[PDB]
Design a protein around this ligand. Sequence first.
Ligand SMILES: Nc1ncnc2c1ncn2[C@@H]1O[C@H](COP(=O)(O)OP(=O)(O)OP(=O)(O)O)[C@@H](O)[C@H]1O
Ligand SMILES: [Mg+2]
Ligand SMILES: [Zn+2]
Ligand SMILES: [Zn+2]
Ligand SMILES: [Zn+2]
Lengths: 15, 182, 383, 379
Amino acid sequence: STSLLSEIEQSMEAE
Amino acid sequence: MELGELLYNKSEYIETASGNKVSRQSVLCGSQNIVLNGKTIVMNDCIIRGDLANVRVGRHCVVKSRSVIRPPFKKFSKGVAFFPLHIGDHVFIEEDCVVNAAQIGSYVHVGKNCVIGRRCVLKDCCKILDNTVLPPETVVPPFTVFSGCPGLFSGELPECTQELMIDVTKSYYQKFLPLTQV
Amino acid sequence: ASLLQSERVLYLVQGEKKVRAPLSQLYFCRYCSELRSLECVSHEVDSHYCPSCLENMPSAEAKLKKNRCANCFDCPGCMHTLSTRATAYYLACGFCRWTSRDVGMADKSVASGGWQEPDHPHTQRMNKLIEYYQQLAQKEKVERDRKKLARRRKEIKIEPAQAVDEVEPLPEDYYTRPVNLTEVTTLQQRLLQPDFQPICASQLYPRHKHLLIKRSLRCRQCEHNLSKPEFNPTSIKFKIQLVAVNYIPEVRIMSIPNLRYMKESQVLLTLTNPVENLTHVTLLECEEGDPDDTNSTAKVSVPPTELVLAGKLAEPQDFPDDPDVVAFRKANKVGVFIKVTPQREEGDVTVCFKLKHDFKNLAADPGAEVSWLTQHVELSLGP
Amino acid sequence: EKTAVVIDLGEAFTKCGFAGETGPRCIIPSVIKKAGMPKPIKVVQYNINTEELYSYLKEFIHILYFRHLLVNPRDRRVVVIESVLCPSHFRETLTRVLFKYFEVPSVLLAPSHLMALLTLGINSAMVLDCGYRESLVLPIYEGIPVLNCWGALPLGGKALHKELETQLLEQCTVDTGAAKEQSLPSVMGSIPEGVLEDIKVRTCFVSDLTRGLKIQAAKFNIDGNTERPSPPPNVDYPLDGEKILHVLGSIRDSVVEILFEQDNEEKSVATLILDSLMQCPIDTRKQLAENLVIIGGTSMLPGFLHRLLAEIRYLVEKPKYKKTLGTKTFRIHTPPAKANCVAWLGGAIFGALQDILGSRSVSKEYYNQTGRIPDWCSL
Ligand SMILES: Nc1ncnc2c1ncn2[C@@H]1O[C@H](COP(=O)(O)OP(=O)(O)OP(=O)(O)O)[C@@H](O)[C@H]1O
Ligand SMILES: [Mg+2]
Ligand SMILES: [Zn+2]
Ligand SMILES: [Zn+2]
Ligand SMILES: [Zn+2]
């Protein structure tokens, strides 16, 4: 599963 | 009555790959351990305490502001540890809520200003009216309202809760669009 | 359920009793095209299950155990499931800290089965009385059939109860003693134990958890089940589903403009079947349906519109633009404007109008599809 | 044959259960919680339009049949315990609800007093029912209720609650707790019925005969000098959390004296039995005097029976009753069930009599054919 930390890191990468 | 508009400023929210819209002001703890299945809304000042155990949350659920998701503590005979918390898909948690439930099923609606005792088990399609306290080890059966202080079974939900609730949560997500940056 | 105010939109249900209720609370019999209400339908008990431990109980066991769970106990101070705790076990409540030690029940070595209810003191005399009256009833019955036939053409004794010459007096302790309200019991918890209503809290022993039931609904006109829950109490699927929302197109209100003697409210007519047509031409006619609560008027200019649903175009979509009529059209969704005349009465703007649609009965069914149903809908604007 | 259910409707409480049982399975306030209204509505209301009563009874009986009794209504017979001289319209509305809607096989409209007699095993006694609305005395002699010698007074639980509310509002001393630790009389306009009922059942008690008479005399206090008995200590009843109503000691024993006060009319709870007895046939008196049965929730108050018997023996010596009922030995019965549900226990004993219960009860076929429920009024 994709942990919420990974999603936050990906969102930071997108910014 | 359709779900009214509820706009948010895009600056203080994070939209994720899976579609979770988690507020910046939300107090995420142990975020490596938290799991959101997508399309989730975590509002401001939400204290999700994933630093104690696995707090997994299903799709399209709504966690309104000032709500704390803290996994419960169970004292078993062999020792002590913290039970992981599981929440099913399409759960509508109103603001100022306190959740210590071991398991919350799908299609559940917790009323505003509610406290759920330690290790409670909420089965699918159950409602908790506002200003209600569920003491620990309280099991809410499906299709029942648990209201009062303490929460006692005081009614049954209509037949089409599985359909009405999945409509309501989807409408809430679809109407939670960001503010116009004019 | 309550997140969207279902009470705002009230469908009327035809029958002996005229009842307005939200669409979610109505059931749509398919054999009788008229939808049926919760008051009109007949309820039956399908199964018994303990709410605390979700264990299904057969009806014979429910009668034998007096509709009570074998294991769970309800706290007497507050109706909450008592929890067994080990030091060698005792019941303790979660909300209030009422322990089994308060009333004085000795700790049971076994976990669950040790705890039991006291026996009623007057059960023996009850059995003696019921046996005596049973044999007397037998004699009366035999006399009755003897008399009937005439028209057409050992023993058990009970000692009478002895009247007490002097009833026990009020103890002098009642005078000159403060009343500790913790010791005495409120009438609700006192009457929770009707067999021996204990005035003192220390003599209020706990009771087993009352069972709940699952309800099967049966249409009264035709004895056909509208809804049948499944065996497993935790299961969510239903064996038979004929809820109204699954068949009738649901009407909701989207826009709520001000009621200053002028407005134009937008309302959506969502379809639930794969394909259908809707035409809300009717506006209650004149004195049709008895719109008692109506306190406004809606034009409801209604060109019929075809709707569909999918679990996931010019002539279907773009040619019927309907700019003044059809506001927005999404999947299984169509918005329509109606010009309310608010503030006719003092307040609480309520508008009544008739919505017409087509239902596929599938009795055999082109004739079934050709049949048109009409439902009286009362919307209540905020005012 | 399936066991017949038993229902005893009352203003204060409804007792429900199954026949051939040691006691009622359910006993609840006779109210229905309609959505939107905070304080629930009384189910059993007299002198109201029949549609509203029909809806109320429908909802309440549905609650009884699908929340407390876990069984279908169609399968099992019904034994409805209704007091004698119950209002007619309420009775036919109740039977119409039972038949037209629930389609029960048959309902037996048994009288409460005769059923209460059945529990003891005797076949003759003077049954006094101290109900919520009113106290009612009826003599039964060999299974024949003597309606001619009935008696009734409005000294049930309702009058007692009203007297308690009046006395509390007069001598009100409540500590609001928000800068009002001192006495703050009548901070609330009216006390709810539940609080009055709890105060009455928990604190108040019936004093001895001599103490009660001294209290009644000292109420006038005509040329009296501290003739009242010393009262019990005050009790601080909590209201609403913070509020603390200091229920005075005097109220706790003076509120219930309205039942036993004569007031220049010779009408009280005790005098009611004597008035009914003096009207009875000459031969029936002794067997009715030696067999007294007391039922009803008000009779369960502590010290009520002792005061009642003492007042009976005291009023017997008065000149009105001295000639007739002077040399009589009154004796109270002690039925197996608590006085709340003695009538229900009688109905439950009658319910298991399967053979007669079919003939005595009114079949739904008969009701559909006629629509007229039997009653002791002229047909
Ligand atoms: N255990 C109890 N101890 C003392 N008082 C009680 C008790 N239970 C009920 N009461 C009081 O008795 C009265 C109710 O009496 P009861 O239950 O016999 O009446 P009912 O059947 O509801 O009414 P009615 O016979 O007039 O239709 C109320 O004042 C209630 O407060
Ligand atoms: Mg009574
Ligand atoms: Zn159980
Ligand atoms: Zn408790
Ligand atoms: Zn039908």
